[PDB]
Every structure is written in C-alpha cells, then in structure tokens.
C-alpha cells in the first residue's frame, strides 16, 4: 500500500535548521513527493517537488531557506535559519499510476514549533454583566487574558473569595501574533451577581498568579 | 495572478445535498485537472479524487465513492463538488486544488440544529474605576450558530486595542468576545459602538458602549 510516514510533532530554536522526514513505503521508494505547508487560518501551500536523487523545485512565494534532500525511501524538507513564520504543519503527498489510473495520498503531517519567543506575563481584563443582559435576568462575567507566552494557563473563578466552578466555560489558549490569548466566562443568573460582594478571575502562568475583581456596588 | 475562488460556507441538515463551486482564474482551465481535498477538524488532508477539466471524467478515491460527484462548467472555468445524502462526518473544509495552487476552502457544517443570530452585549468598566491613561471596552457575542461571526469596531478603528478572542462552544451554541482600548479622555467623551456580523443568519447587531 502507498503509505507516507511522518513525525506527529517537532520543535526548533529560531535561527536553527529543521530537517523533517517523509518516508515512502518499501515499494515506491524511488517516487517523487510534494511538500505542503499549512498555517492556522490559511489553506495549504505548495512548498516543493522532491525527487529520489535529492533534486527539488520550490513553489511561488517559497523563500530560499526551504530546500530538499533524499536518501532511499526518505524525503527530507530542510528549513535553514528557521523563522517564527515557518511555524506550521508540513504535509507530504505522493501520486501513483496503475493502468492509466491516478491516485494521490497525503501523509499525516508534522506540526512544527519554532522556539525562542519572549516569555510574557498575562494581562487580565474583567467585565461585569451589562444592564441589558441583567434585564433578561442573566449575568455573564468576561475574563479576557492576553499578551502571554508560553500558552500554559489555569483559569479560576471566585465569588465571595470562594471558588466557583458552576457556569464556567474557559477557552483554550489561542495564538495571536507573537503571543497568546484566551477567554473565560462566568454565567450566573441576575441577583446571583447582586447577592455576592465582589467576583474574582485568577490566572496562573509559570507558577505566578495574576487576578482581577468586579464590584456589584 | 492564479486564483481558485470557492463558494462561501454552507450549513446543511443530514440527508440534504450541497453543491460547492471553484472558480478558476489566471491560467487555461482545460490545461489542468482539478483535485478535491477534505480537511476534517482532525486537520489531516484527504484526497477525494480529481476530474479532467475537458472531458469531465471524474476519478474518486476509495473513501469517496457513491455520494460524491465532480462536475464542470468549462465555459465559466468552474468546477463543482456535490455531496449527496449528507452525514455529520461530512462536516469538513473542502478544497479544490490544481496541485501547486489551492482554493481558500469551503466550510460545510452538517447539523440538525437551527441557525441562531447572536445576542450582543456591551462590556464597560465597573463602579470604582479610574483607568488612568487608557480605558478598555468590549462586546460580548453570545449564543450563535454556526461559527462564522466577524466583528468590526469603527469608533477608533484598526488595531487601537482590538483583540478578537476565539469562540468556545458551551451547551448548544457559540460565544465570543472582542475588546478595544482607547484613551481615558476619548470615552465617555467621543461615542464608541461595535458591529457584529453573523453571515449564516444574514444579521448585523450594533451596541453603543455607555458607562
């Protein structure tokens, strides 16, 4: 069977050289493959064609730091002086013809992480429920976490200094530029908001804790 | 100059049928065949097959026999993908690809759930507040379906402090927030409002931020 094998993930420091492997099955080991790059909010992009002898040809908009090499059944994507914009899933693809019948196959892909991004403490912004939402006798409290690196956070809610888990929905940290952002909401009923003296959103990042409060006064 | 432009997002119920287009520009349409690729939330790209853009002869991958059909409008330089008797598992982004050029994708959502317009609430600072130099204001976009929402703030404009926080799916529906940071003497001095756009429900909500 026409099978391509890749790693699930890999990390590299900024300015280093990344070598990714795409492996052709026992048979087909002399086959030409294609490399594609896929960034988070974009469609896949053609990177190059890579033949069995290491011969390669890149696509349009592909910088010079992208090159290929081959061994036997192994096809390598070499990224020289890796940049933070090169953070993407790199997928390889291979075609096969039988009796005039074309079939194409993609590999599982390799998620590439570029390290050396500056560490940054989260910024917390807490909003109380609007008068409008309170007219519907509902109350959503918003915690907006931003400007942090690395992604790892713990979002926690407190009412009267007592932890609240009921009605808490926290997002996963999402990349936004050179850092991360995440959000968390606390859905209480109205008067459930008004019967408590203050509310607190705590965020723990790198062992450090940052917190903000609201006052129904 | 080469561009493959696909039709917009689609929300269908199971058992329904969807037709996706792919408008080719910048090269002779009949010179290259068109591939169709599926990218389910797992994000793994899956080749669905291809079609000769002159004959209209399709070739389907093993996983895409029966329910999938590729067609053309050669005169219009347009390739079509039709999925019949839809299933939840058909929820994916669909691409048309020449190979070296790809379409932007078409999100197909297979759901029995109705399209819901979002509720938009203003986010302004608390009672005992003196933000000193700059004040932060937000817009809470709650209970919408599906997830194609797009927000614009035009009281200050661009990235003045506009942060768009991604959606989270609690219970039935989606919720998002978007904030803006302006100078403490621009609000409540100069009026600030936000514009929420849900394309699936063809609506646009606007909320004036008041203290």
């Amino acid at each position: 069977q026409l099978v391509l094998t890749q790693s699930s993930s890999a990390s590299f420091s900024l300015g280093a050289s990344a070598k990714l492997t795409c492996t052709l099955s026992r048979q087909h080991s002399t086959y030409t493959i294609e490399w594609y790059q896929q960034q988070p909010l974009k469609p896949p992009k053609y990177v190059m064609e890579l033949k069995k002898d290491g011969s390669h040809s890149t696509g349009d908009g592909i910088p010079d730091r992208f090159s290929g090499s081959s061994s036997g059944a192994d096809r390598y994507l070499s990224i020289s002086n890796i940049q933070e914009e090169d953070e993407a899933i790199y997928i390889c693809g291979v075609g096969d013809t039988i009796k005039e019948q074309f079939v194409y196959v993609f590999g599982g892909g390799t998620k590439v992480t570029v390290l050396g991004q500056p560490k940054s403490t989260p910024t917390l912004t807490v909003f109380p429920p609007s008068s409008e939402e309170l007219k519907e006798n509902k109350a959503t409290l918003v915690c907006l976490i931003s400007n942090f690196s690395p992604s790892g956070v713990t979002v926690a809610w407190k009412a009267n200094g007592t932890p609240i888990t009921q009605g808490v929905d926290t997002s996963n940290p999402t990349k936004e530029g050179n850092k991360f952002m995440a959000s968390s909401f606390l859905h209480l009923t109205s008067d459930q908001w008004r019967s408590h003296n203050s509310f607190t959103c705590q965020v723990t990042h790198e062992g450090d804790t940052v917190e903000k409060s609201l006052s129904p006064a | 100059q080469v561009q493959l432009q696909e039709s917009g997002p689609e929300l269908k119920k199971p058992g329904e049928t969807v037709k996706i287009s792919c408008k080719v520009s910048g090269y002779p349409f009949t010179n290259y065949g068109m591939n169709w690729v599926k990218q389910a939330p797992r994000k793994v790209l899956k080749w669905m097959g291809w079609i000769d853009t002159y004959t209209g002869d399709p070739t389907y991958a093993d996983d895409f026999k029966g329910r999938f059909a590729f067609s053309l409008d050669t005169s219009a330089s347009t390739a079509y993908l039709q999925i019949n008797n839809l299933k939840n598992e058909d929820t994916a982004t669909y691409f048309c690809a020449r190979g070296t050029y790809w379409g932007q994708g078409t999100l197909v959502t297979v759901s029995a759930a109705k399209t819901t317009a979002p509720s938009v609430y203003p986010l302004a600072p608390v009672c005992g507040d003196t933000t000193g130099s700059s004040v932060t204001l937000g817009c809470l976009v709650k209970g919408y379906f599906p997830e194609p929402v797009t927000l614009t703030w035009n009281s200050g404009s661009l990235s003045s402090g506009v942060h768009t926080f991604p959606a989270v799916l609690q219970s039935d529906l989606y919720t998002l927030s978007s904030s803006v940071t302006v100078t403490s003497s621009t609000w409540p001095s100069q009026s600030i409002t936000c514009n929420v756009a849900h394309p699936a429900s063809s609506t646009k909500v606007d909320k004036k931020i008041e203290p």
């Binding site: 086959y31 693809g93 291979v94 075609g95 013809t97 | 010179n31 591939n35 853009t53 190979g99």
Partner: peptide, 12 residues
C-alpha cells in the same frame, strides 16, 4: 497536454 499536475511520470 492536459493532466493532473500531481501526476509525475516517475511514479508508475
């Protein structure tokens, strides 16, 4: 002249 751009002659 026309074919699938993904089709490589060496892959038969």
């Amino acid at each position: 002249e026309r074919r699938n751009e993904l089709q490589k002659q060496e892959n038969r």
